[PDB]
Design a protein around this ligand. Structure first.
Ligand code: SF4
Ligand code: SF4
Ligand code: CL
Ligand code: CL
Ligand code: CL
Ligand code: CL
Ligand code: CL
Ligand code: H2S
Length: 346
């Protein structure tokens, strides 16, 4: 029954059978109870602070050819850019002046920066007294080592999907096995480590989602980034169906349940498919938000949302925006860097 599954979740009887059934029920009441649960677990384990990770998308060059991704190398209908290192440090400084306690440096897999330019940049931001998160893709162990010694605190490397055949068809440059080795390496070197998947990928079944969850649980990732799949028009998946918001939201809730002291963002994709989607996610298990901090002209001063379309006046609008959001949700800003605090067990 709907009632019995919530009870198995409470006792942490996290079997394949239970996760599958929980993902299979579409009853509104069951869903609402699951979200109140995930929220209650979030309050108890990670508290009311909502942590801001300022994202600087500093280069959109990528060497890989992932099929879902607007940054894939075969996409010629994309203006490519690279910020200078100095532009980056100074932008970060501006973020820090605006209150950001974590800076995320993210890109396509762009060789130009790797490894030394990254190291020098990271060293420089760490002088600024903030946490540093990297999201640069798959690289040799030697690069992860240099960036860890350089002072990086965290690394996001979403696993996207745990079905290896699906992974290899979608990311023909690589494999799930390779992705797993990178995640493992990052964990062993002492990074705060983030994984996660897209939901509603073409060919992905509920069973695959179950496997994603079991995966996350198995490895105890510090962070889990989850969002719905959103077709990108300049890719081979332009014409595939979008991921469902409720289903993705349920993945987020379940993720909080499985990994109660972890950091779970309300991803931008979530705010893209449903109005108020980020806020909704934050009231359903999530405890982090990641505002775009990329400067013009790399970033249009234009953010589509459904119906609405936020036309901001300045480079810097989103940090104040999200602080305001956080305040209005009755949540609290982070007092510290908001890194993972491994409680709940042993
Ligand atoms: S490595 Fe990242 S940026 Fe490059 S195509 Fe794959 S998903 Fe996109
Ligand atoms: S300022 Fe606009 S784009 Fe930025 S987070 Fe707020 S509503 Fe969204
Ligand atoms: Cl990216
Ligand atoms: Cl990415
Ligand atoms: Cl982070
Ligand atoms: Cl996102
Ligand atoms: Cl992003
Ligand atoms: S990435």
């Amino acid at each position: 029954t709907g009632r019995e599954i919530l009870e198995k979740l409470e006792r942490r009887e996290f079997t394949r059978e239970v996760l599958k059934e929980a993902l299979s029920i579409n009853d509104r009441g069951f869903n609402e109870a699951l979200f109140k649960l995930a929220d209650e677990i979030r309050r108890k384990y990670v508290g009311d602070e909502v942590h801001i990770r300022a994202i600087i998308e500093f280069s959109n060059v990528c060497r890989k050819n992932c099929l879902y991704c607007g940054l894939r190398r075969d996409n010629k209908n994309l203006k490519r850019y690279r910020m200078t290192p100095e532009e980056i440090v100074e932008r970060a400084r501006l973020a820090v002046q605006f209150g950001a306690k974590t800076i995320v440096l993210q890109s396509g897999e762009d060789p130009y920066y790797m490894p030394d330019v990254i190291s020098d940049i990271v060293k420089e931001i760490k002088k600024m007294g903030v946490a540093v998160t990297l999201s640069l893709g798959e690289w040799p162990r030697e690069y992860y080592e240099k960036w860890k010694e350089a002072g990086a605190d965290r690394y996001l490397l979403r696993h996207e999907t745990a079905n290896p055949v699906l992974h290899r068809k979608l990311r023909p440059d690589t494999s799930f096995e390779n992705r797993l080795n990178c995640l493992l390496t990052l964990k062993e070197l002492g990074y705060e480590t983030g994984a996660g998947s897209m939901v509603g990928l073409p060919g992905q079944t509920i069973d695959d989602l179950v496997d994603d969850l079991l995966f996350l649980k198995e490895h105890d990732f510090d962070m889990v980034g989850i969002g719905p799949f959103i077709p990108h028009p300049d890719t081979p998946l332009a014409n595939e169906k979008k991921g469902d918001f409720t289903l993705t939201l349920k993945m987020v809730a379940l993720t909080r349940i499985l990994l109660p002291d972890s950091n779970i963002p309300a991803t931008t994709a979530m705010g893209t498919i449903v109005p108020g989607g980020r806020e909704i996610t934050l009231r359903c298990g999530a405890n982090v938000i990641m505002p775009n901090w990329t400067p013009s002209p790399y970033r249009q001063l234009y953010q589509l949302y459904p119906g609405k379309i936020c036309v901001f006046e300045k480079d810097t609008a989103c940090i104040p925006c999200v602080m305001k959001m956080i305040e209005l949700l009755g949540r609290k800003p982070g007092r510290d860097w908001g890194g993972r605090k491994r409680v709940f067990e042993t």
